[PDB]
Structure formats: structure tokens, C-alpha cells
Amino acid sequence: DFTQMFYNQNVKQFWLPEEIALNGDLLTWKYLGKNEQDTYMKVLAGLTLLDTEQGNTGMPIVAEHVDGHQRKAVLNFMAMMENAVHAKSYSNIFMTLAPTETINEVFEWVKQNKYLQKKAQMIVGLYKAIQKDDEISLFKAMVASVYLESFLFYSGFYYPLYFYGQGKLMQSGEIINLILRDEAIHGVYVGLLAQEIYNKQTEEKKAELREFAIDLLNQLYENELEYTEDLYDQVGLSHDVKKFIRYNANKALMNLGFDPYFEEEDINPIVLNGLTVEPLKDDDFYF
Amino acid sequence: DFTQMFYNQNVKQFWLPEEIALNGDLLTWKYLGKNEQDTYMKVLAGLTLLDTEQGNTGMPIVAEHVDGHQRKAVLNFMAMMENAVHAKSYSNIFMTLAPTETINEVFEWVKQNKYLQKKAQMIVGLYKAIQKDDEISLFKAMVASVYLESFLFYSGFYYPLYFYGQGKLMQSGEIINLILRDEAIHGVYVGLLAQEIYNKQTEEKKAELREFAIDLLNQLYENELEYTEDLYDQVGLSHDVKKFIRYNANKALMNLGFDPYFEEEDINPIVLNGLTVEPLKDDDFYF
Amino acid sequence: VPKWIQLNNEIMIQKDGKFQFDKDKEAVHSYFVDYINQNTVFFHNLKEKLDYLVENQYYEEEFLSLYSFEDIKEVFKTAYAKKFRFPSFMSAFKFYNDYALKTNDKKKILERYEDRISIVALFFANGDTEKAKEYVNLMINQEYQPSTPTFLNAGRKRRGELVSCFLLEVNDSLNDISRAIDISMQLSKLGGGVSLNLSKLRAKGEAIKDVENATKGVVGVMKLLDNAFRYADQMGQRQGSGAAYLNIFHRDINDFLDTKKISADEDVRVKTLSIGVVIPDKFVELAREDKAAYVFYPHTIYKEYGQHMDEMDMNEMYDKFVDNPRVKKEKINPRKLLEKLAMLRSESGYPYIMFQDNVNKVHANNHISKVKFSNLCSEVLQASQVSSYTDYDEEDEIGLDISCNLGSLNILNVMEHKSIEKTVKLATDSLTHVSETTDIRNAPAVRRANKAMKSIGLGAMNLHGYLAQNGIAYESPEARDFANTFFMMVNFYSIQRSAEIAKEKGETFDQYEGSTYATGEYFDKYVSTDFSPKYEKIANLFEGMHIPTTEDWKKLKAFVAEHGMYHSYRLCIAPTGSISYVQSSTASVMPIMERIEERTYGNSKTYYPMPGLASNNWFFYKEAYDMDMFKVVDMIATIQQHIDQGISFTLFLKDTMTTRDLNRIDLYAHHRGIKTIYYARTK
Amino acid sequence: VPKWIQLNNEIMIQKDGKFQFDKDKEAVHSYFVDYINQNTVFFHNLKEKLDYLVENQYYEEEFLSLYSFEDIKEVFKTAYAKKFRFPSFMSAFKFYNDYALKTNDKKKILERYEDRISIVALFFANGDTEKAKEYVNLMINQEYQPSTPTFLNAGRKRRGELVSCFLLEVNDSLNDISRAIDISMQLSKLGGGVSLNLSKLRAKGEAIKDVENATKGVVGVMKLLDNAFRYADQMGQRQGSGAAYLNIFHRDINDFLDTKKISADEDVRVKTLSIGVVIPDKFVELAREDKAAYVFYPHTIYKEYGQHMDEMDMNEMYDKFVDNPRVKKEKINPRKLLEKLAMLRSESGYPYIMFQDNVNKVHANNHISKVKFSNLCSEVLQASQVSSYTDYDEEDEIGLDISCNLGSLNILNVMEHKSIEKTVKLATDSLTHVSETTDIRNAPAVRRANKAMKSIGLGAMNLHGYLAQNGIAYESPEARDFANTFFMMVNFYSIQRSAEIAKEKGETFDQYEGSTYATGEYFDKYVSTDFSPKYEKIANLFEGMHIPTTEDWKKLKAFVAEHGMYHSYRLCIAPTGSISYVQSSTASVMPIMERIEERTYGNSKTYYPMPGLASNNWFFYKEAYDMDMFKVVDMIATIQQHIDQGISFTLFLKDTMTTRDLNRIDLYAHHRGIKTIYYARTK
Ligand SMILES: Nc1ncnc2c1ncn2[C@@H]1O[C@H](COP(=O)(O)OP(=O)(O)OP(=O)(O)O)[C@@H](O)[C@H]1O
Ligand SMILES: Cc1cn([C@H]2C[C@H](O)[C@@H](COP(=O)(O)OP(=O)(O)OP(=O)(O)O)O2)c(=O)[nH]c1=O
Ligand SMILES: Cc1cn([C@H]2C[C@H](O)[C@@H](COP(=O)(O)OP(=O)(O)OP(=O)(O)O)O2)c(=O)[nH]c1=O
Ligand SMILES: [Mg+2]
Ligand SMILES: [Mg+2]
Ligand SMILES: [Mn+2]
């Protein structure tokens, strides 16, 4: 009942980072403190890693196991967006704002950062555990994918949105909003596929799947807290970002057909502001 | 040396089925004989069936085994074009020209056809034989992929190009020309990835891979001749189609860095109408 | 944000449900009082100002020296006696940002509107103080507007050429192509638009010195011309503009049109070169009958007949070319070519369409030559003779290249003052002076044709503004009736002034004896038909003015037979792009594109309502895109029957109109006598 | 596959671990017997063949009319008496595919090697039968090879010019730029390569008629010239090739160099125009000291001093330009510019490098002018004077352009026949005849300079071939000793022949009296130094040949002082690429690129071993990429000390070499007196 409308929405949202000129951010970037620039680079690098694996591994593997040519076409399109559009856009931003050495250093930093490695290990592990014709392993990977789309990106998205909302780094911010617009529909779509599998189960099996989903969310959440503190303490925003990731965790659960898990909190209003030819006939020659 | 350049060329060639209005083809379709309509339907179904294998297996399997983030992104983009753009385009052409019952029957016939099946299963067999961390099996699959993209499609493309060059079925011919333009670049790109593997091999292993490629080409070519007579004798075109197959076989070989196998021939003119910095150290100035 | 911009932006702020049109008078008043009066260089008296301007290489002293300073002072006082006030902000802004003389640092205003008008009048009078005062009254009343080149450059030492329209014939040879490139660069350097006829160049795949498949066709020459026009960009402020015209029966016609396709390869794309197509009646006849047509290789025709293909009558020579084996031709679909033209005009607005038989069936100088192509604005239609540029040390055979200096009557102001005759005659005198004072040092054919033909172009503007400010629909029959009567009177008085000038100077234009003016064939319709208004409402607009009758036209015909005609061409209706703002008039005889014109200058946006726009006449200011293009064609054809040259005719198309609608509009224009079609503008 | 091609491909098939070199003789014999004899038209006698060729518009009848048919028959018998046999398949293939006259349909062969040689000799002799026989003996012995234009076109009615290298000075004006474009197109239409000096054009951002920032710089003119050369691409048979030269101190040097960057935008990128840089010793001195350098705006210098920047001595005027406030200049990093040149040459092989002070420290005609730029092959170094092309109807100030007709001595054949003197004198006579019979009627400066300076280029080829076939390493001191002696003898005999021609005709070249030949300063090193071989092995190579001594050079100096010189310039070693196969020789004086050349002709691949290649001389046929470029520079400098013009010097680089190695090679060449560097070829 939904794939065709998602197909149409995905293809009509098609974009390339080159459509957005980035030289306009040069001055507002120059004006940020060293702490702010550091957090910003690292945040986008963490996002780049997530999209790299979502494009290389997550979306293609889910596409392989989901039945139906139209469902596969949507998932293939989403995969392309992840690595050919989203992951690449971050390099466009980096190449504009930062010198090569700072770019090299931040990519080295992703490799050695323990929270980023842990979250990649956990998510990619679940993708690679999918067994052919085994719907339960597929469900588990789809939960992981929804958590990546609708929860994990948001510790990263906070900062570009926070600046956009203050009228700073607005070209980079425009790119990020386009990425976010895509991930929102990706999270909903994968969520609907996960619910299909969940709804086939006995009540006993469903109870176990909810346990899996909640245990996984909590494990990812605890790691994301440490990641958030590590990045945002130097810019004074860790508590604010934490509220934002809890907000988005609830959206991820809802995409999976589950009740919200965290209590509602006031999000920084700045971040909220950050959001023809026809032939000639014979009679045409007479008047 | 080449992936970013191909990335650029691929994304700038992006298109959607909806861009070409198909209904005006009915004004020339109605004037074709039964044999012409039959051949066109059968050719179209042949292309559709082969392209589906490439979208579901060929491109995604190569993307899976190739190392490199940028290569995986380009390959993902190509897989997207197969599944999201090409497949929808072929379906659109069919739905415009034939009623539902006729489409189902043509696909039943072509699905049972000996020559179409022989080539489809030969290609798919090589994709299924790729082994993790074995570059020889990957190379063999890449050869199969290049043969599909740059050679096997062309016994089929001949007919739409033949009409397109005569002013018949111009809307569907425009679509086919866009598809063909994508397959050409797909073949060249996968060809470069195959040459990379080939160049890493010993001289004895190279000679062995050359023998593999020529042997495979021979098997496919002999089946193409039979496929060609089966479809084109009823419309009197087989002689010219055979010249077009050999010409495209030579292009496929050149994509794989190999010499042409067949002597140069002229093509039907109607189809043609359709178609290390280092710094000076203050001592370099003294001798 | 300046105060005047704030006041002007209040136009769109609707109060009581209606636009605040009165804010424009306030906007212009504030603009003046706060910018212009402040930034105007102060001089104690006219003598000091004139001495400063002449000394600092601003004003040429040649024209000023012809008058005693008392005469110059009297002319300047005459200019200021009117107390002229710009009625809207846009007019004054345009004048003081484009035409007002500014210091070399571009920080101060040396010229007011009155000073510029007085300088232009003194330049025109050529020593005649009373003539200068008449010119001052004509321009200060805004009855006549000299073209942008003449108006801006007149009397200026740094001034460029007062003529801005140039047409060049290119002969089929490397020497001629090189000379054409050189002349195009030379004329663009002067700031004038250059139009070239490429129909004589042999098609791609023709032999050079019995070597076959050597010629590159008209597209290689077009690439050369595009690069030449790009190089001579006139400081880059206004990019070099050139137009290439090709006959539809030329072999390279398809490649000629493919240069304007967006999908075209970059090695074939011609970015800076406008393209026009010349369509004889034979092509329209072939497309109407759906017959298969042929495009000919020009050099084969030239070898077979010793004359160029575009020098022959295609309606008489097409069958002979087809039946002649020695003539090389390839088959085309005329209807497919027409559809391709419509598609190209929809996509890019190109090419310009010239209906050769419509132009030449009323051409008065067919004896000199037929009109083979048009200019960059598509309204210049004159006989041209190709030049023979030979090798170095060999004498060149200089032909005739077309050029005309432009002027526009303000229809609203000419009708309000009831001064059609006097305004037309003064404009003709000023255009003649500009023509006589022009000497092009690197365009031998242009200079020779200027000396021999004495061609001038007297256009008109504010037709739609005048009609709307008088309760007349542009598409209505009354609008066409007024246009017929007014332009008949304009033609009558321009012919009378040309004959009077010929009588006073004792000379006619070269080869006048063979023209239709000399034989009287020109005056047949005027001596046989009465062009007085057929509607009482229109006839009342001409009250107080004498409308020439058949007897008056008979007298004028006899007078011309006695004394001849000084100008081979007198009337052409150019677009009149930016000078219309200064005159507060609608552009040319076209209908207005928008009721209120929104434009962004600097970082502040400005609104320009159509002159005289108000609630009462809001409905009469119908936009062109909302108009029936058939009625626009009817109006232009009504005007065109009294214009000896062409009329820049832009087609205003809605996005929903198919290529068939554009083809039908072109076919109706050809049927109705339309000579050229300028642009296909889509909303 | 052709039988001869199969025989040739057997060359690479190793037998006993050795290449089957004898298979090439079988390949050539099979090629002849199976294709050439079959496709050679049959004529009963020579009289019938000559009549058929003259009547059918194949030969020019005028030059053949100077001989009685008895003399023509004697000359043809002399050519045929030799029974010349091509030693390899590639020689005969190249001759019969490029130079052998073929029927208008290119189906049959009308000329053999003997026929072409006889026709060329009869054209050279200009009515002298004994001289024609001498020319026939020279060419059939392959001691002298006329340049490809002369060899191909001599005696042919439908022929291009026999001179194919032209150098054009461009003055800083629109008239001069347009004339330069026209002349370039006219000369490329003739098949000759055109080199243009753009150093007198003002840089980007200069004022045009006291309006600042109006100039597009040399890059806009470069785009114009590139399009002009693309258009006049020799009827498509050979794409128009042109070269642009800019002094390194020109402000547009960085933009000029950026036109050859691969990443360059298509708008700025120039595709078919070769670029060379003229580097004065001042730039090298600045880069050596790492001092900040300045690039100057040429028009500011011209206004301040009244002369062009490239017309002045940079080594003396650089400090004055830097200290002059009225001269505009831009700070640059000279070492960064050098490294940019090295990287651009590594990536694309451009630009050509002309060391201006190396050229002019030995230039014999500095009184006429300094040498400012080179040709498209970088071996032409002559004084030029810029022309002043004015407006139409004004008189043009025609200057001096550069053009020389080329011929190559076959070093191996000349040394085997011990005929340096006779071969050099006969080649000088033939080149003088070619220059005298040349008249370009669309390049006034070229025609005037050809008539006034009488410049010829006598080159040499087969230096590496001759050395390898004599067991001498190209990089050895013995090879340099032989080159020194041989080219000293060549220069001596060319000077003697020029003096003899001046005495016979009683006329020297224009402004000879001011040349170093007239004052005797040219002969200083020859009268003070000895150039006889210092190695007994090399001295033996010259046995039977008189090596001019210091006394001989003193006598020649006295003879020149008494009679003068006919040629302003005599010797230039052009690349000589296509005709090297026919001569069976190594190209120019450069070392061989590859021992066996693999070519593709159609679908058949042909194998060409280096002429004379064998097992016993394999080691001496060392490839250029494996040689030390310092030793190649030493060889070229040894040769260049006896050449009045330049030597086309290609650098052969390995892919491992950095830009620093290329810069070091360039700096060593500048140190060693190299004048120009042609190409940076990487393996
Ligand atoms: N709309 C306008 N167009 C042209 N000039 C104007 C305009 N408005 C003002 N000026 C110039 O600015 C001067 C001052 O304008 P302002 O309306 O204040 O004048 P004033 O003292 O009321 O009398 P007057 O209208 O006779 O000048 C005017 O004399 C005229 O020179
Ligand atoms: C020289 C040249 C000419 N042309 C075109 C431009 C001219 O319109 C056309 C004629 O060239 P011309 O300059 O007139 O050549 P030609 O007069 O010597 O030869 P012919 O008498 O046979 O015409 O050829 C090219 O396309 N490329 C070229 O290189
Ligand atoms: C006309 C023109 C010239 N130029 C350049 C090319 C010439 O080398 C240079 C001089 O042009 P000129 O033809 O010499 O112009 P000019 O002589 O009237 O001006 P001036 O007195 O300053 O010499 O300007 C352009 O770049 N673009 C142009 O449109
Ligand atoms: Mg000609
Ligand atoms: Mg000048
Ligand atoms: Mn993403």
C-alpha cells in the first residue's frame, strides 16, 4: 500500500551537493572558535562514517533480502543516496572549509574513536548477521537501520542545525537539511518493513522482539551519551544534545510501531528554527 | 585514476522515465506489420529480462566484492539506474504499446525461449560463482558483466535504433537511447575494474584469463547468432544485425583492454542515424 | 535602503485594495532631492560649466564652436524653460544611471536631462540656433527620442559611433571571411550590433579548389564570428552581440539551427551569436503542400549559374535547381523544418524569422538588390551588395553594407501635441545629420553604403501606452485603425521631408531612378486608398491634425517624381529597449509585457508601473502574454504597411502553447504580410 | 592481412633468441612485387608519361618547359640508373603513401621514387640539365632530403607552398590582431605551420583608449587564434597547427601557461595551439637567487619608453622597469614559475622553451633585430620586425616576418660518400631556389622578409643512426667530437656557398653590412679555434675529406668580407619526422626513441627497426629515454655552436623523473648554450 508513494517521494527528492554553492559559509566558519570548528568537523566525520556503512552495507543487504522489484528499487535508490550523495556531500563541506591536513586528521580520528567504532561494530554486525530466508535476522537488522536513520544521526545533525538556526553556516546547513529530509523518509520506510515482519510473529515472539529492540536502543543510547559528551563538552552543549537524541529515539521507536521510551523535554528553540510538440496539419496553413 | 571522473559522468546523465511522453508512439506502432510488432515485443522483453538480472544481481554483487568507498558509490549509482530507472522505463514502453494480456504472453514466451535463457543463465552463473576474497572469480564475473553491458544488449538495441533512425517509435527510441548510453558507461567502468585485477596477475595467469574471456565470448557469440536468426529472419534484418553484434563485441573486448576479435565492418546507416612536483634546491642552478 | 527606493517599494503595498501609484511621484521627488541635487557638480554659470566640460575632454569642441555663446545660452535656457519633471522614479533613475554625463571617476553628475537635451540639440542643429531650439523643444516635449547611441554619445569626445546597427554581407572566400571577422570586431569595438549574412558561404562538405569535402560550412564561420564577438566585448559591460542569418534553402540550415540547441555539443554551440533564418515564399508553399523539399549546396549553384543562391529568386529557381544535375541538393521535410524552428524558438527564442517575399514584395529598392537578411534586432530591411575582398596588394570590390541610425517618435506625446508632421520632419533632419556625420574607418562597405543610400530609421514608441491611456484595447479594431492612420501620416510626412531634402540638396540616394519611388509604383495604394480613421473615436484623436488624403498623396507623388527622395530607407521600428524608461513610454509598438515591472538594481528591488497606469485604465493595460497573438500580428501588419523597413516583432507565448501554436502564429504572420519575427518570449 | 605485412611482422618473431631483421628486406620486396608494381600506372615511354601528367593537371608545365625532352629523359635515366632499392618496408610504405603522386581517385600510383626525385631535381635546376643531374645524384644517393613540403609539392600543379614554417609578429592593436588572424588562416590554408609572437600585446586588465581594465590579454587573442587554426585545418587533411610565444616577463605569462593545464576551463583552455616561452637570462638569474621577480604590463612600458617590452634589453631594463612608477608590474616567484613550467611540460610537454640570451649572444643579425620567439618546431631563430597594419584606406607599415624552407643532410650517406662540401653546396642552391620561387600574396611581411633576408634552413638527420652504425655511443665524447667536426664543416661550406651566391648574383641580404658576418665577429671562434677531431677514431671517419682549418676559416672570412653573404640565416635542424622513413634514417640529430617502432596502419601493425639495427650494433642503438639528458644536452650544444638558427631539441623523460629533474635539465641546457627546448616527452 505504500512502496509506490515512497518510490515517487524518493526520486522527486533527488539532489547533488554541487547544486549548493558553499563559498558563502567561508566567513561564518572563519569566525567560529577553534573548539567550535573541531566539534563541527568531528560531528560531520561521524555522520560520514554512518552514511558510508549505510550505503556500502546496510541498504544493499536489506535490498537483497526484501522481496519485490519495487521494494528493491526503493531500497537501492536509498542506498545510492547514502554513499553517492550523503557521504560525498560531507567531503564537499570539508574541502571548502578546511585545509587538507585538518581533513586528513579528522578521518584518522574516526578510525581511532572508540564510540564511533563501537556503534559501527554493533550496527554493521547486525547487517552481516542477516540469514537468507530468515525473517527474524532481517527484522533485527531493520531495527538497527531505523536506529541509525532516526536516532544515531541526530547527535551529529544537532550542530549544523544549531548554527543554521542562528543564521550561521547556512549553505552547509542547507545540505544537512536535505540529508535530514532523506533520512526521515528512509527511517519511516524501513520501519514499515520491520513492522511487517514483527506482525507475522506469535505474541511470545513479539515480546522477545520488543526486548531486542529496547535492549539494543539502550545499549546504543549509553554509547551515544559518551560520544555526545566527548564532542560537545568543549562547546558547552552536551546536555542540550542529549535531550535532542532522546527526542529522536522516541521517533525511531514510533517508526517501529512502539511506544515512546523517554519523557518529553524542551529542545533548544534555535535547533527548532534550524528545521510540447505537435505536428502541423494541412489546415494550419490556411486562415 | 578514474572513479571520480566516472562518478561525475554517471550523475550528470541522471534521468527519469516520466520525462519522455510515450503516447505519441501509437501513431507509428499501428502502422507496423505483425512480424515487426512481434519482433519488437520479443526484443523488448529480452532486454527487460537481462536488465533485471543486472539490477538484482550483477551490479550489486560487484559492488559487494569491490574494495574502495568511491567505487562502491559509483557501482551503487549504476545499480540504482538499473532498478529505479531502466526497469520502470521498459515497463512504461510495454504498457503503452501492448494490452496487459499481450505483455504477459510475450514474457511467458521469452521466459521459455532457448537462446534468451542460454545467455541469461550463463551470465548469472558467473555472478553466482564469485567467492569472497577471490579476485579471479570477481574478474570472471566482471567479464560477464561487460559482455552483458557492451555486447549482449546490442542484438536487442538494434531494432529500436532501426526504427528510431527511420522516424518510427521515436518516444520509446529516445528512452532506449538513454538506456543504451547508461549501459555503455557501465560497461566501460566495469571494464576498468576488470583490467585492474588482470594487471595484478602473473603472465601465465593473464594468458589463462585471456583464454577464459575469448572462450566465453565465443560461446555467447554463437548463441547470439542463433538468437538473431530466431528473431530477425521474419523481418529480413539478420545479416545487418550480425555485423552490429560483432562491432559491439569488439567494443566489449576493448573495454577489457583486449584486442578486437572480429574484422572491422560498416554498420547499417539507419541504425547509425538512430545511434612528481619537487622544489629547486638552490644547487640546480650551478654546474 | 535609500528613501526613494522605500517610497517606490510602497507601490506594491496595496492600500484600500488598490496600488499606491502616487508613491512614484514621491519616490522620484525624494530620489532627486536626496541623491541627484546632492551629487550634481556645481557650476556658477553655463559658461564655466561648458568650459570645464570642453577642457576636460568631455564635450567635443567642434560642434560647440559653430555657435556663439549667446546662441548656446539661449538653447540651454530653452531646454530649462519647460521645467521638465520626470513623472516616475524609473525614468529619472534610468537617465541618471545610463545617459547622464558623470565624471571620469563616475561619482558625480555633470549633465542634467536639460543639459543632455541641449547638447544633443546643438549637435543636431549643426550651427542653426533656431534649428537647435526646435530640437530642444522636440526632445524636451519628448515627442522625439534619439536612439541610445545618438542620445548618449552626441557631443561627447569619448563618444562611440552614433550608429549602432550594422549589416554585413560575407562573400564565399577565406579573404572575405577574414575581412568579415575583422569588420565585425571593429564595429563591435564601436558598440554597434553587427548582423552577418552567411547564405553565400558554401555548405559543409563542399570542395575548395577541386578538393572535395573540404569546406567546414557556415558553422565554422559562425564559431569564428562567435569568438570574435566574444573578444570585442566593449569593455565587457555590454557583451559583444552579433547575429548570423541563413537562408532556409541553404544546405547548412539544419546545422545552423543546431548551434542553438541546449543539447548541442560545446564544440558546435555558439553562445554569443544570434541566428536568423530567411524564409522565401517557396518554403512556405512546400510545407503547406507537404511536398518534399531540397536544401542546396550554394557553391554548386554559383558554379552552375555564376550567381549566388541567395542572389536569385527561389520562387523561380527552385525547380531549375532541383532539375539541374550539376546542382547538389539533399532532401528535407519542410514541415519538419518548421516544427524544428518552432521548437527552437520555444526553447531559446531563436532563430529570428525573416519572410523574404513579404519583405521584397513591397521593397522599393529591388533594383539595387533584394533584402536577403535582417539585423540583430530584426527590423532593418535594406538592399545590400556583397563585397569582394581580394588578396593583399589587390584592389577590393567594395559593395554596400547596411547601417541606419535610429530615432523614435513618442506616439502619446506626438498625438497630445498634434505635431506628427513637425516631429517627423525634425526627426528626419536629425537622423540625416547623424547619417552625414558618420564615417566608419574599418568598414569600407558600411561607409560606402551610408554615403550612397543615406538610409535612416525613424521608429515609434508608446503605442500601447497611448492606446491604454485613451480607453482603446490593443487588440481592438480601433487600435488598428489608429495605428493605420498614424503610421500612414508618419510615412507621408517622412516621404515629404525626404523629397524636400533631396530638392534642397539637389541630390537623391544612389540608384534612386530605378526605385519604386521614382516610377510612382510606391504610391499606388496611397493614391488609390484612403487611410483616414474609420471609427469616430479614432477620428477624434486626430482632430486638429490634417490627415493626408488621396489628393495629398497624389501631390506628394508628383513632388517626389519632380525632386526625388534623399533617403533609400526612412522608417524602421526598433525595440527601443532602455530609452523608453526616460521617455516614460511603452517599448516600441509592442504591447506591454507586465503592468508593473519589478526589477532588482544593486541589492534593492524597484517597481515600475506602466506609464499612465491607474485603476481606470488598468484593464486596457493588458499584458502581451494574455493577448491573442493573432491580433498582435494584425496590428503589426497594419503598421507594417506604412513602414518601408521592418518592425521588431516579439512573440509573447504562454508556457501552455505547443509548438503548433507557435507555427500557426508564424504562418499567420507570413500570411498577413509580416516581414520579420524577432523573439519568442514565453511567460 | 597483406603478405608483405606478414613478412614484416616476422621481424618481432625471435629466432635463436634474435630478431629476424632480414625479414624486412623480404617484406619490402613482397610489398613492391605484390602492391606497388600492380598499382603503378603503365606508360609506354617517358614522353607519354610526361604528357599525361601535364595534361591531366598533375604537373606544372612551366618548369618542365625549360628543358628539351632529351634533357628530361637524361635526368630521368640518371635517377633510374642508380637502381635504388628501399632497404626496409617502412621506407617504401611511407614514400608511396605520403609522397608518391597518385591519381585523383588515390587508386593508382603515377610516380615512383625515381620519378619524384627526377621531378624535384628538374624543378631545382630551373632549366640546367647538368645541375638537374647533380640534384638527381644527390637525392637518389639520399645525401640530401628536401623538406616534406618541397619534396611532396615540387613540380605539382595542385600543390601547397614549398615553405611550411612561418613566424608572425603581432602588434598591439585590433587591426594588427585581425590581420594576424587572417594571415594565420591564409598560411595554414597553404599547409604551413604558423608561430605568432604575442609579447607585444598588452596584458589582461590594461586600458584601451584611456579606459582602464578593458584588455582581455593574450588569452583572448589565443582563443581567437586557436579557433582560426581549427577553421583553417587544411581542408581536414591536416589539422591547422599554430604556436604562440610569450615572453616570461609578460604579465599574462601565468594565464598564458594555464591555457595548457588539463584542469583548465574550456573557456580558457586552448586545444590546438602550441605555446612557447621566451626566457631571458634575467629570469634565470632571478630564479637562481630566489629573488622576488616582477612581470610587467607591456602597454605601460610602451607608453613610458615608446618601445615594446620585448624590443628592449631585459637584462638592462628590468631594474629600470621595476623602479619606474609609470610602469605597472606584478610580483611573481621566479622559482615557482620555473617549477610550473616543469610541471606543465611533464603533464603536456608544453611550453616550448626559448632561451633568449643564448639565441642572441651568437645571433649574427642583432642589428636587424633581436630574436624574440621561435616557430612551431622551435628550430627557427631569426630577426623579425613587427608590421603596423592600419585602418582601411591607410597605408600599412609592413615589417619582417620569418619563414625558411628546410632541407636535411643525410649524415650517414654524406659521410659514406665523403661529400660534405658538394652536398652542402647543392642543398644550399636548392633551398635558395625554393626561397626565390616562393611568393605568399596574403602575408606581406612574410613575402617581404623572404625577398629581403633570403633565409634558408639546412638541417641534418641520421646522426644517431650514423654513430650507432659506426660503433659510437651517442653520449660518448667521440660522438660529440664527430658532431663538432661535421657541423663545423657544414657551417663552413654553407657560408662559402652563400658567399659564392652573393658574388655570382652581386647581392647580399638586406642589412648584411651590419651583421657579424660583415664585421668579421662571426668568424672569431673559427679563426681562433680548431674543430678537427680530437679522437683518432673520429678523425678516421673523415678520411678522404678535407676538414677546414683556421687558415681555411680566415680565407672564408676574407672572402665573405669581400663579397658578403646571400643568406641572413642558413642552418636550422628541424625535427624532420615524416621523411626520415623514406631516407631510412634517424630523425633529426636526436637519439632514437625506440630500437623497433611499432605502428598501426589500418588493422595491420607494422614493425620498423631502427635503420641499420642489428645484433652487433644493438647496444649502440640506445633508446633516448635511457640516455642521460645531460649528455644529450652536451651533444646538442656541441652541434648548436655551428648552427646559426636553432636545433629542435626534444627532452625524453622517464615517468620516475620529478619536476626538479626537468628543471635541472632546463637549467643545464641554458648553461650549456642551448637556444630552444622543443618537447618534454615522458615514457
Ligand atoms: N520629478 C523631478 N524630475 C526632475 N527634476 C526634479 C524632480 N523633482 C525635483 N526635481 C529637481 O529638484 C529641484 C527641487 O525640487 P522641488 O520639488 O523641491 O522644487 P521647488 O522648490 O518646489 O520648485 P520647482 O518645482 O519649480 O523646482 C527642482 O527644481 C528640479 O530641479
Ligand atoms: C581556406 C578554407 C576555406 N574554407 C571555405 C571558406 C570559403 O567560403 C570557401 C572558399 O574558400 P576560398 O578562400 O574562396 O578558396 P579558393 O577560392 O582558393 O577555392 P575555390 O575557388 O574553389 O572556392 O571555403 C574552409 O572551410 N576552410 C579553409 O581552410
Ligand atoms: C578593441 C579591443 C582591443 N583589445 C586589446 C587588443 C589590443 O592589443 C589592445 C589595443 O587595442 P587598439 O586596437 O590599439 O585600440 P586603440 O588603438 O584605439 O586604443 P589605444 O590608443 O589604447 O591603443 O586592446 C581588446 O582586448 N578588446 C577589444 O575589444
Ligand atoms: Mg574562391
Ligand atoms: Mg593601439
Ligand atoms: Mn544518509
Ligand SMILES: [Mn+2]
Ligand atoms: Mn538513510
Ligand SMILES: [Mn+2]
Ligand atoms: Mn539497465
Ligand SMILES: [Mn+2]
Ligand atoms: Mn547497466
